[PDB]
Amino acid sequence: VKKLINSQISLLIGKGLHEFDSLRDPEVNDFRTKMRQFCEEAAAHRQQLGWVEWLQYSFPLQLEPNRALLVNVKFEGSEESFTFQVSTKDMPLALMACALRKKATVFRQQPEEYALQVNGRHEYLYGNYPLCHFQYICSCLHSGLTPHLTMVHSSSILAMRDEQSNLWSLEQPFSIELIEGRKVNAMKLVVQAGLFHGNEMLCKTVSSSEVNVCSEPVWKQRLEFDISVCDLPRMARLCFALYAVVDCPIAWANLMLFDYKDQLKTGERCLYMWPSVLLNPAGTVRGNPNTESAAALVIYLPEVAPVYFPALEKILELELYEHEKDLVWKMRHEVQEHFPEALARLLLVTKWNKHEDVAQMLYLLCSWPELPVLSALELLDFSFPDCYVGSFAIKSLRKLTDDELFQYLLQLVQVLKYESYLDCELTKFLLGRALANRKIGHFLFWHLRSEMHVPSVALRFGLIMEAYCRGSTHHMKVLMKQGEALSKLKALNDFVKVSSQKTTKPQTKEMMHMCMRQETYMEALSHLQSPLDPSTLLEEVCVEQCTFMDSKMKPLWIMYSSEEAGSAGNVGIIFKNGDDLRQDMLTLQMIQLMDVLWKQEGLDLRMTPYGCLPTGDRTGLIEVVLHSDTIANIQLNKSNMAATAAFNKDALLNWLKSKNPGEALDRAIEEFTLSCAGYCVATYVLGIGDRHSDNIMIRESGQLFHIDFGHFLGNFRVPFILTYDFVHVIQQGKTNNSEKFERFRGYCERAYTILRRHGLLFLHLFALMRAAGLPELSCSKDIQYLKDSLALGKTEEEALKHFRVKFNEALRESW
Numbered sequence: 001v002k003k004l005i006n007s008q009i010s011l012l013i014g015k016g017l018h019e020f021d022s023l024r025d026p027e028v029n030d031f032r033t034k035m036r037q038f039c040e041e042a043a044a045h046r047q048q049l050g051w052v053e054w055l056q057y058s059f060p061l062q063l064e065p066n067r068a069l070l071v072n073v074k075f076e077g078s079e080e081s082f083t084f085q086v087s088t089k090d091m092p093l094a095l096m097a098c099a100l101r102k103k104a105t106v107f108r109q110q111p112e113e114y115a116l117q118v119n120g121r122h123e124y125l126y127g128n129y130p131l132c133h134f135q136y137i138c139s140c141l142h143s144g145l146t147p148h149l150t151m152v153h154s155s156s157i158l159a160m161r162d163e164q165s166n167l168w169s170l171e172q173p174f175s176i177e178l179i180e181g182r183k184v185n186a187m188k189l190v191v192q193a194g195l196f197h198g199n200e201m202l203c204k205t206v207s208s209s210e211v212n213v214c215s216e217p218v219w220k221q222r223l224e225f226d227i228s229v230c231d232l233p234r235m236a237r238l239c240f241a242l243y244a245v246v247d248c249p250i251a252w253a254n255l256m257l258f259d260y261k262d263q264l265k266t267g268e269r270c271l272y273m274w275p276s277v278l279l280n281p282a283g284t285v286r287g288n289p290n291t292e293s294a295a296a297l298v299i300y301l302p303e304v305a306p307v308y309f310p311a312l313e314k315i316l317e318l319e320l321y322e323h324e325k326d327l328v329w330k331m332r333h334e335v336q337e338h339f340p341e342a343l344a345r346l347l348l349v350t351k352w353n354k355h356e357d358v359a360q361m362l363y364l365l366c367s368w369p370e371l372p373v374l375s376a377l378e379l380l381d382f383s384f385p386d387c388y389v390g391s392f393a394i395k396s397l398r399k400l401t402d403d404e405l406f407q408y409l410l411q412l413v414q415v416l417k418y419e420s421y422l423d424c425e426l427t428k429f430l431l432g433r434a435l436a437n438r439k440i441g442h443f444l445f446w447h448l449r450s451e452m453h454v455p456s457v458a459l460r461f462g463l464i465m466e467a468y469c470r471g472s473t474h475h476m477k478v479l480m481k482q483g484e485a486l487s488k489l490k491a492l493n494d495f496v497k498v499s500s501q502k503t504t505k506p507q508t509k510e511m512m513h514m515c516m517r518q519e520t521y522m523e524a525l526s527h528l529q530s531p532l533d534p535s536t537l538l539e540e541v542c543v544e545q546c547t548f549m550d551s552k553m554k555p556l557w558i559m560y561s562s563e564e565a566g567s568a569g570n571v572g573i574i575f576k577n578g579d580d581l582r583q584d585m586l587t588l589q590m591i592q593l594m595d596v597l598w599k600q601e602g603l604d605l606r607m608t609p610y611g612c613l614p615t616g617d618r619t620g621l622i623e624v625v626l627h628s629d630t631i632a633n634i635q636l637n638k639s640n641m642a643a644t645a646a647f648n649k650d651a652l653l654n655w656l657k658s659k660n661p662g663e664a665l666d667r668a669i670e671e672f673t674l675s676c677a678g679y680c681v682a683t684y685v686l687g688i689g690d691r692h693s694d695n696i697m698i699r700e701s702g703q704l705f706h707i708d709f710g711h712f713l714g715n716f717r718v719p720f721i722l723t724y725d726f727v728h729v730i731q732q733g734k735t736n737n738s739e740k741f742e743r744f745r746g747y748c749e750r751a752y753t754i755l756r757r758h759g760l761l762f763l764h765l766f767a768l769m770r771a772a773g774l775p776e777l778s779c780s781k782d783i784q785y786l787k788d789s790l791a792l793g794k795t796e797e798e799a800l801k802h803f804r805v806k807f808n809e810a811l812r813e814s815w
């Protein structure tokens, strides 16, 4: 049976476990077995959680950042249901009290023994919270809909839990022998080596001598570095570049001078090199897995005697101008005593190529108080390679709530790429958090699963997903069920592209359905948790309603229903294969983040944060927003329709009218204006260009939102943007309506200002994303786009002035 589990894992993680053994690699082995131990202890913990604690683990609450309402409630056993009137202000327990008072009266006759499930969802209502704090209850009020809940008894919840069971002495200047290579070019070759700690070099980059273009080159020479061997910090990173010239890059390669046992490396080494777009400190520190084809650099770390980096207790024993640096360093204790939040800045002035200073720094670091989360996110930047700093940052990060953790999960995952060794605090942290919360577990998995086609991370990511699994057998099954669905989706989509290239849409659509109607597909595509959101159940796929966009990548449109979930189980997923969804996902997360920040100062711009989730190689899902359509479509202004207008500019408004009769119209225009402001500021701050009426959509509520991102931070300076046809809708259909127009400027103005206040949060976040290799996010010039857009260097009186110019500027540009 342990064989079954094993093969399921390899199947799930897209890498077979045998590959881990084949490497006969102590680091991997250690990682594997420690991390297995760790996770199995988590899982053990879990299997004995109390039932309310299990609910917390498995269906964590979904909260928002007096008045009446109809709620429909019923119990698990029977179909009989009651529709109560309760306040929006009542705790779930009041509602439960009612249910039971009604059950008792009908059924002829203990609220604390219950949780309320949202029907047809993995979602629950419990805790000491008024109902309109629950996103679902909240969502329902906004759309008019009657919450539909089931009284689920403690014995039943427990029944679920049960089913889910499983030194200083060495002062000579550091040096290497470059022996030779085995590679491909056109011209002479050179090797450049430099020793890095983070971005900053520990001295100059002693190159090679020029040698002929050749294929199996030989060097046999000492390169000696301008730094004492007893200096080298724990995280010293030796970096090579191989190029050709009469400048033209071929390959690059990095390694730690110390290994994971804190032993300085000796002697020889063959470095399987990575292809080029000269020096790449950021790049991974483990070799190219394609050993057949890769250029190989053989080098010689010499035996300076074994040599270990000193224990902590031995250590404990022992932008700004030149002088300013000197002063911080001097005032470092006082910096610790009175400004504990300036650590980053002090850390960037400590002399990392002088061991004594790194001792003095560390000793302060070791007594340093914990920092706020925002500061910790900054310390995770690659500028802080030291693991004592890493350890510090994780320790400060422990106070992250699950919602926040979820919020920055994509970034923390990306930062694993910076990591120097497989076993590290960040891995332990995330795994601990993922094992403690099934939603984090879900998304960690997919963040990882989705990058397995990527050589430099395949091993690392593979090993974590393995760990996770050892820690959650049941969740593993739930995830294979997702994997099988995505596998069928890929097959289905390939059929679609081949076929559509030979036949009319109607025909391929017919063909797609037959394919889908195969037992093997109905089985695969049904009865699963959405990878976009584990608390959304994809029950039966509605073949009749599925189709595909007959352009470009031919993405698929997959609809699903649920009897038990009714309306709210009528949900859809888009499956796209062929494009990178990373850019899209990132963009959508940042907007979602804007929305959370705005709501936290009580400003709700009625945003539409739909899931977008990469799952594999140029493959992921996008969550369908129903009841929506593009501006472009609407603006096609077709005859024999409700919106049929005398003037094109009326199209969009007629559409809204037709979707929103009588008194409803006002609120629609209101939703439109609110979301409009939101999206306007978000695209503007983010530098999202090439908006046009094809990539904007409105929902029937009037809510406006954006699709197909792929160009941000100004990677065409993006002006703020006002479309006349929106300005026309904001104005209630009037040529001049400056009451309504200026309320709009107001909203834009509030949302702009709130974002500036968390400017640092975006910066630190994007800082972390640089780890991802997204081509529109490659260097400073990009993070600078954000500084400029949030005019972060200015005062709030100023920036607002600045913004006002831009906004008026956009107004002129509107017709």
Ligand SMILES: Cc1ccccc1-n1c(Cn2nc(C#CCO)c3c(N)ncnc32)nc2cccc(C)c2c1=O
Residues within 6 Å of the ligand: 547, 548, 549, 550, 554, 555, 556, 557, 574, 575, 584, 610, 612, 622, 623, 624, 625, 626, 628, 629, 630, 633, 706, 707, 708, 709
């Ligand atoms: C539904 C629709 C109306 C107007 C114009 C285009 C669409 N649309 C869209 C427009 N669209 N784009 C979306 C997106 C995205 C990420 O950039 C999207 C969404 N999340 N929810 C609803 N609609 C969305 N996407 C499709 C994807 C696959 C298959 C199909 C048939 C479509 C599709 O028809």
